[PDB]
Amino acid sequence: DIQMTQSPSTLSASVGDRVTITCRASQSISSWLAWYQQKPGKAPKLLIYKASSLESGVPSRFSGSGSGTEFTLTITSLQPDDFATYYCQQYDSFSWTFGQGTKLEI
Amino acid sequence: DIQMTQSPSTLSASVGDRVTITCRASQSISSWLAWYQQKPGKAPKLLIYKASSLESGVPSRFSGSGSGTEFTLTITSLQPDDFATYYCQQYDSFSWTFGQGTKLEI
Amino acid sequence: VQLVQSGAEVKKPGESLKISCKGSGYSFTSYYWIGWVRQMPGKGLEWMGIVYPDDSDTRYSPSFQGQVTISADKSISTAYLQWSSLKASDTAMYYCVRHPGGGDWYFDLWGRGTLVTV
Amino acid sequence: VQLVQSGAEVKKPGESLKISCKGSGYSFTSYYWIGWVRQMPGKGLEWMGIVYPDDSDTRYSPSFQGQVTISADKSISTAYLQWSSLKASDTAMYYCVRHPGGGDWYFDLWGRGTLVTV
Amino acid sequence: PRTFLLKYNENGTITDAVDCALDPLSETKCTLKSFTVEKGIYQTSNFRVQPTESIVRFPNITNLCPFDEVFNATRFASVYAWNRKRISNCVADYSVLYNLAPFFTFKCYGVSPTKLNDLCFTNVYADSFVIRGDEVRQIAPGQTGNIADYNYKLPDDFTGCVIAWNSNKLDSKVSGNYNYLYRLFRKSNLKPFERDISTEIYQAGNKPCNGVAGFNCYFPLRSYSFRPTYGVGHQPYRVVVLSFELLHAPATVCGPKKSTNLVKNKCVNFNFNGLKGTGVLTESNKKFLPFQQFGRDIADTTDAVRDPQTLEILDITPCSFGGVSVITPGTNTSNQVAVL
Amino acid sequence: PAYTNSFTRGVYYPDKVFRSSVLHSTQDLFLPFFSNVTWFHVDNPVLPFNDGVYFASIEKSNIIRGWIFGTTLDSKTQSLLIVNVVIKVCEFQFCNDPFLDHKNEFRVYSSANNCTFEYVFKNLREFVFKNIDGYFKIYSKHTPIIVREPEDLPQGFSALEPLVDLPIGINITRFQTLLALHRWTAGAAAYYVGYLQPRTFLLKYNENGTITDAVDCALDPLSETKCTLKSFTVEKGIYQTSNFRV
Amino acid sequence: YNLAPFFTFKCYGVSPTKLNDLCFTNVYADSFVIRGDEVRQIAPGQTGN
Ligand SMILES: *[C@@H]1O[C@H](CO)[C@@H](O[C@@H]2O[C@H](CO)[C@@H](O)[C@H](O)[C@H]2NC(C)=O)[C@H](O)[C@H]1NC(C)=O
Ligand SMILES: *[C@@H]1O[C@H](CO)[C@@H](O)[C@H](O)[C@H]1NC(C)=O
Ligand SMILES: *[C@@H]1O[C@H](CO)[C@@H](O)[C@H](O)[C@H]1NC(C)=O
Ligand SMILES: *[C@@H]1O[C@H](CO)[C@@H](O)[C@H](O)[C@H]1NC(C)=O
């Protein structure tokens, strides 16, 4: 199974900051990465598909980039809406795997 | 696209009279004409299919005849509900075409 | 054995228009050709297209081909008439109609109707 | 356009249980892959499996292969996760998810979740 | 099961019989079609040494071929950019293919399916793509259509198997899957096993088409728009074409056959990398170049072979045979015979 | 353009079958005997590809390192790069002057995109390049040679053994030699190009399996007589060899 | 070749591909409707109702 390692495990930043979560894959997965956001006690919300294309209904400040091993999820300005755990899911191949997750915190 | 001309465009006849309506085809159709009753603001209801047989729920007063290019629709005794628009459509070949319609008045 | 159409609605030009027809009261709904007929205000009926719900095969009149898109959701026994680029000419009341099988290609069942004015 | 999931169920270890989720608000339900994803409390998301309601085709994950039993019924558009002999480790949130076909295998819709407690 | 010569008398009663295989005299009787033999020498049958045992020699390879990646890939390539994967240096078990699905097509050319596990191939190549179901017929030698003409052309003398199955579950999207593309316009038909990935605008007319995309100026590639609702003919089908070279050579790909020990100087049945025969294998002084794996005589019959394991040159000689002649004084004189 | 005589060069082993003490007739793409082969000094023109190419190189310092094969030799069409071995079938945007500079290195292409296939005067290296059924076949033979005149191809017989077959699957109509500018100033090395033709050859396999000699059947009436009689020696007489047909 | 997804096109005495390259003296098209299992009955020298 393709293994997703997501860094950093916990990140603390203030409102209005810019953050760059990174996700790395054991095997090259082209651009088939999805970025999800889960608030505590809430279902995760799909944010990024095709590693750059934002899901409709998601704030435009979210952005994704990278291919192959490296993937970067960048938020230009943080808000209390942005403070939730972030996951990276590869869908290049079956037996889909999720990243450990990043706990974005105030 | 078989073309249908329906004559006369409007007909006025007293209640209880026998009324005849002619549907003419651009090219011959082998008894594949259908006659519909459309009351104002209502859904057309099938009276006659194959130009001879009549749909269930239609009284015997309504009748049809003809073959080839020429077809006829006849009412022996008129009724208050009988007066309304009448349509003829060929289903011999696709791209089905309707008649212009005949408005019936007392 | 009835066809219930979507409620009549008014939309401005350039909008996407979808009209829904659901058939009830007869079994094997997917095996009946379901089509749409257009009546302009003060005009005769014009056949527009038909769809086979089982295989989604579509047939269109030459005038309405491309201009309309007719689809069939066999799962919920429904047929959809989809118009793009609504215009003033796209003002008429539409009938959902049912076809018998075999060589009988008249419209045995007619819906109540769906007026659309642009 | 969202998935409705059953309420939380609490059972002692060694008991069979079945958790149901039905999608609603979207057409062609049986032609969308419906999956289960497990999140251990205070742990990362783990994809459990997926099922195609139309033909009842399942693709379980290797970790959960031979243990979970995911099935589906297209009549009510409901996907069932049947777990037999609940073990102690089987105390986690279960999310019903839907994902599109084609190359887009990402889980666009997520269910609210069931608090399966063992 | 035996051959007998039966004497029917005037009344139809079998009054005597001769067992043709009993002894040389009876064989002479059967060959002469008579119960009496005159003095002379008669050619009756052929002596032939029979093989004592069966020997199988296949390359010392155990790793299975990567058919799993070819057939169980999450997303296949488009037909205009069909993907070619080299299958080599592995054991090819073709039994796994049958079990996967009720295949729409598992049609083989130049071979039979059931015998694929008994053969060795020099270098297998798997070409994978996605097409429409109605276009599945165009994946065959000497076919006409958009896929054959402008996307993927099979050679007329094509040796290999075309496998096509329904991929509605994985390649159809309700909104529509536009990822898969096919070439619709090209200047000339593709030669067999050639790939065109050029995106230059097709100039049907005289006026140039530098991206104008006008009349007679079209982008060659077009989308498929697979949807689950459409019928089987419009549903996507995944196609893998396995092409292999059967003429014997250093065989990287072989079936799952367990090699026996190499036994020399005895008449044996032998199977060297799918080459089956009967003969005596002996040490050979013939010097083979590395690409040379067997030797042929003037009748194009394999007279020397190279052992797949030990890379040893072995001469193959037919097991001893000859004619058999029966010298008889005559059945009237005696039943004694001599055998030459 | 300078020209010279191929003599009996350019003969390769038709198949992988071992044959000994036999005369074998084979129909294949061969270099015609005594053909007019164009010879260059180190000059890297875009020589066309016409059903196959025979490329000979006489040198001692490895000026010729490879070749590029393509139809347009630009990014719009996919092309083959072979260099001394790295083989790449990519949509190369080749430079007008492809050469390699070595420092005591690839100037061939500005960029390489959408790769589909990846693989990794006393010396005469003879090569045969063919492109059939999407397969690029390369045959090779190396011989130490001594030349009285550098221009002349050595007169004799040597056979080219199969080197490699590549499933490149492209349309090749042109080729260019890759030259090493040495330590730019590069010393001239002789390289000869002869175009292969569909020809029938009669090959003599000796006791050790080597192709010692051959007869090119369509060279002249004597060779056609030899091929018809399936012998390299013809006795006195008159022989019906073939039929001329317009 | 655009008629129905899986049409059965069976040519006796000719090839499906070669029809465009040939000239035909007299051509007749015979149209009818039958059961699918009876389709194989429509061939030279076959047995069926
Ligand atoms: C591709 O995936 C399928 C499904 O997982 C594999 O098919 C299974 O193969 C095993 C061993 O060969 C059998 O025991 C199962 O019964 C098969 N399952 C089904 C549903 O057929 C298949 O082996 C994989 N690889 C290839 C090359 O097809
Ligand atoms: C190969 O390329 C040449 C020139 O680019 C062209 O004339 C020819 O038609 C091409 N052949 C094929 C089979 O694409
Ligand atoms: C070879 O070609 C050159 C120029 O094309 C010509 O001058 C010469 O005579 C030719 N030689 C032979 C043997 O054909
Ligand atoms: C060729 O490479 C270019 C450069 O990235 C890319 O835009 C194009 O899509 C590629 N062509 C194909 C057929 O992949």
Numbering used by the authors:
A (entry chain E), B (entry chain F): 1 to 106
C (entry chain G), D (entry chain D): 2 to 119
E (entry chain A): 272 to 611
F (entry chain B): 29 to 70, 81 to 122, 127 to 146, 154 to 169, 184 to 246, 258 to 320
G (entry chain B): 369 to 417
Sentences from the paper on this structure:
Here, we report the isolation and analysis of two anti-RBD neutralizing antibodies BA7208 and BA7125 from mice engineered to produce human antibodies. While BA7125 showed broadly neutralizing activity against all variants except the Omicron sublineages, BA7208 was potently neutralizing against all tested SARS-CoV-2 variants (including Omicron BA.1–BA.5) except Mu. By combining BA7208 and BA7125 through the knobs-into-holes technology, we generated a biparatopic antibody BA7208/7125 that was able to neutralize all tested circulating SARS-CoV-2 variants. Cryo-electron microscopy structure of these broad-spectrum antibodies in complex with trimeric Delta and Omicron spike indicated that the contact residues are highly conserved and had minimal interactions with mutational residues in RBD of current variants.
Interestingly, here only one RBD was in the “up” conformation, and the other two RBDs were “down”; two local structures of BA7208-Fab binding with up-RBD and down-RBD are identical. At the interface between Omicron Spike-RBD and BA7208-Fab, we identified eight hydrogen bonds, three salt bridges, and one cation-π interactions. Three salt bridges included R346-D92, K440-D56, and K444-D105. R346 played a key role in the interaction between Spike-RBD and BA7208 confirmed that the R346K mutation in Mu RBD was responsible for the impaired activity of BA7208. Further structural analysis revealed that 14 out of 15 RBD mutations on the Omicron BA. None of the additional three RBD mutations from Omicron BA.2 (T376A, D405N, and R408S) were found to be located at the BA7208 binding sites.
